Amino acid sequence: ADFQPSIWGDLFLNCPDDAETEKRHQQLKEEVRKMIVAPMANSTQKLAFIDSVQRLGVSYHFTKEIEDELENIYHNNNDAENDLYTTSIRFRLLREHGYNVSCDVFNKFKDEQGNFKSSVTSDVRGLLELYQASYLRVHGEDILDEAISFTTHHLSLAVASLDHPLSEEVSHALKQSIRRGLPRVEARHYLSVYQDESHNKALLEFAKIDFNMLQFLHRKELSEICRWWKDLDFQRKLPYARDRVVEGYFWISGVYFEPQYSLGRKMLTKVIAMASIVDDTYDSYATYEELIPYTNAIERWDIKCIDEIPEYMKPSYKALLDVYEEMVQLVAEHGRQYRVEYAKNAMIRLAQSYLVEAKWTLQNYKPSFEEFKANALPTCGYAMLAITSFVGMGDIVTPETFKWAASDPKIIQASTIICRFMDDVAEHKFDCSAIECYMEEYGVTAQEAYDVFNKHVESAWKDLNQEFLKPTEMPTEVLNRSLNLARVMDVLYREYVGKAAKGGITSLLIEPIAL
Numbered sequence: 001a002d003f004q005p006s007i008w009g010d011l012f013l014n015c016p017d018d019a020e021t022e023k024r025h026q027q028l029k030e031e032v033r034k035m036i037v038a039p040m041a042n043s044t045q046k047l048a049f050i051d052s053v054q055r056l057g058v059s060y061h062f063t064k065e066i067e068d069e070l071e072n073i074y075h076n077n078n079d080a081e082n083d084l085y086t087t088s089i090r091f092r093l094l095r096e097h098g099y100n101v102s103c104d105v106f107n108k109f110k111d112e113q114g115n116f117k118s119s120v121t122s123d124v125r126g127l128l129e130l131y132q133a134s135y136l137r138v139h140g141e142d143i144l145d146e147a148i149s150f151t152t153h154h155l156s157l158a159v160a161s162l163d164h165p166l167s168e169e170v171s172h173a174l175k176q177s178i179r180r181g182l183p184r185v186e187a188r189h190y191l192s193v194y195q196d197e198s199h200n201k202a203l204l205e206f207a208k209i210d211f212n213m214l215q216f217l218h219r220k221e222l223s224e225i226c227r228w229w230k231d232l233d234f235q236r237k238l239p240y241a242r243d244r245v246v247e248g249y250f251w252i253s254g255v256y257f258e259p260q261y262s263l264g265r266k267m268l269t270k271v272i273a274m275a276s277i278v279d280d281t282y283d284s285y286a287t288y289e290e291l292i293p294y295t296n297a298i299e300r301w302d303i304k305c306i307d308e309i310p311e312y313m314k315p316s317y318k319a320l321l322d323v324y325e326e327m328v329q330l331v332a333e334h335g336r337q338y339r340v341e342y343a344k345n346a347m348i349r350l351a352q353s354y355l356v357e358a359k360w361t362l363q364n365y366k367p368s369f370e371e372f373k374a375n376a377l378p379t380c381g382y383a384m385l386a387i388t389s390f391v392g393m394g395d396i397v398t399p400e401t402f403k404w405a406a407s408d409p410k411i412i413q414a415s416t417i418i419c420r421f422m423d424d425v426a427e428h429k430f431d432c433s434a435i436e437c438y439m440e441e442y443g444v445t446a447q448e449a450y451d452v453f454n455k456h457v458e459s460a461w462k463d464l465n466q467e468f469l470k471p472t473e474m475p476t477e478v479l480n481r482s483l484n485l486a487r488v489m490d491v492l493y494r495e496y497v498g499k500a501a502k503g504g505i506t507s508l509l510i511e512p513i514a515l
């Protein structure tokens with residue numbers, strides 16, 4: 001076809017490229033540590049402050065300290081009474097962190113009529129926090145179900161009369177919640193709004209420097225991956241293949257940005273790249289008769305299968321077996337090989353579902369509704385990315401972790417729903433369409449369809465939140481992988497490569513922050 005190329009060209013290829021500032025960093029870090037443990041004027045300020053530490057992208061340094069503060073605040077509360085702001089932010093932060101705070105804390109804010117009290121509509125700061133906090137609602141919490149609409153409405157009505165920076169913060173929240181945003185894309189935006197009165201000087205400085213140090217690190221990782229990709233030469237060799245390596249790395253850097261997951265991003269990014277090439281190969285001038293050997297050789301995964309596939313497919317097969325064979329070397333130094341087979345297996349599952357999707361488009365065979373229902377969720381590859389993301393995490397991950405991920409746990413389901421359903425609407429809205437099928441099956445309209453699909457996304461989100469409420473099926477760092485994948489969707493597939501991918505790639509990878 002028309003091979004490649006990335007819109008980024010060689011911007012990221014070459015390796016990227018002050019000790020005083022590193023010493024600053026080390027020192028600010030301890031200062032910020034101590035302002036988290038030390039008292040503030042009251043519980044609300046301690047809460048606001050932790051919120052900022054989280055929103056500025058640096059809470060990963062202070063996980064235990066922040067946790068201890070939140071436990072105290074949970075076990076030591078006079079619900080009666082905090083404002084709407086104190087109640088909301090406390091409910092949001094505690095729920096994010098797994099504490100079972102009842103939605104009844106919002107009862108107090110209604111009139112006997114059952115409408116939201118009149119006073120409430122005037123408390124913008126309180127509406128913002130309530131707005132944000134209602135993205136933490138799970139099932140059976142109608143008050144927060146009402147809150148989201150109530151607050152959405154009255155906030156758009158107040159944007160006009162607001163003075164910066166509060167204005168910016170509102171307009172932004174109606175576009176992007178704190179909860180479904182990608183921590184790092186949001187961090188870059190809050191760094192700007194936080195700089196604008198009474199903000200903590202040392203927080204804001206540490207977060208600026210930390211942001212650049214990480215950016216440096218990612219810039220190193222992305223250069224190692226691009227050099228890797230450049231040698232594959234999928235340019236001449238695979239005319240029909242897109243080039244989405246940078247966009248992949250961004251997706252994956254959303255699964256985890258932290259320093260400790262550096263090997264993770266590396267392995268994960270190669271995987272998603274090959275997945276892409278595999279996807280495209282099922283979506284090119286491959287005929288079905290070529291796809292069954294291909295899929296067949298993927299199922300058996302052995303270099304000997306390379307002689308059994310059409311010549312044009314050998315380069316993707318060899319690249320593919322090479323990625324995993326490498327994952328095994330990189331992870332051998334702690335005897336974590338056993339993780340790789342699980343990831344192989346998920347790639348294979350994914351390729352089997354591509355085979356079926358392909359037969360449908362190439363043989364134009366209209367599937368019944370539940371034939372379609374059964375085969376659609378596993379074309380997503382979020383099970384594959386979650387599972388594979390574990391390969392390069394630390395000891396928190398365990399053979400049991402892979403036994404749980406393979407069994408389809410509620411948190412991977414929820415993220416799959418979110419993926420499959422946002423990806424469909426987004427395609428129709430802006431061959432084989434879930435919406436197109438829903439329209440035929442129940443005889444409704446695109447809009448009425450969008451209605452039902454989004455209604456499902458929101459319920460999937462409620463399941464997701466719920467999966468963090470203690471006790472949990474798995475450690476938090478295991479669940480965040482799935483949360484973050486759900487966040488990649490909300491950020492990247494809502495109303496190429498898109499102003500969203502381009503916009504985020506620039507702020508996290510190209511433009512540093514002026515100290």
Ligand SMILES: CC(C)=CCC/C(C)=C/CC/C(C)=C(\F)COP(=O)(O)OP(=O)(O)O
Binds near residue numbers: 279379423496498500
């Ligand atoms: C996604 C980027 C880079 C920017 C955002 C722009 C938008 C809204 C893209 C929606 C199109 C898209 C990538 C898909 F439908 C994924 O289909 P894919 O072919 O990737 O997987 P299948 O589900 O069709 O097998």
Ligand SMILES: [Mg+2]
Binds near residue numbers: 279280283
């Ligand atoms: Mg595709």
Ligand SMILES: [Mg+2]
Binds near residue numbers: 279282354357
């Ligand atoms: Mg496809």
Ligand SMILES: [Mg+2]
Binds near residue numbers: 423427
């Ligand atoms: Mg698609």
